[PDB]
A = this chain, B = another copy of it.
Amino acid sequence: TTQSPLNSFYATGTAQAVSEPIDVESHLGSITPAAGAQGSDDIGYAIVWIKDQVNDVKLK
């Protein structure tokens, strides 16, 4: 009568990667010496947000 191939069974899921691993927002400052002067000053900072299940980051 009917001979089934016994293959018509399926299960399906989805995957996505919609975000980059890091986000960088800058809060740097300024360097204001006189002409030819020597000095040092703190510039500011830069926030590096870490995204989903990211544990170690290697940057350049």
Contacts and interface: CB of A to CB of B under 8 A. Distances in A.
Interface of A: 1-4, 14, 40, 56-58
Most central of A1, A40, A57, A58 by chain B CB within 10 Å: A58
Contacts of A3: 58
Contacts of A1: 56
Contacts of A56: 1-2
Q: At the interface, is chain A mostly helix, strand, loop or mixed?
A: loop
A14 B56 CA distance: 32
Sort A-B residue pairs by CB-CB distance and give the 7 closest, nearest first: A2-B56, A2-B58, A1-B56, A4-B58, A2-B57, A14-B40, A3-B58
Contacts of A4: 58
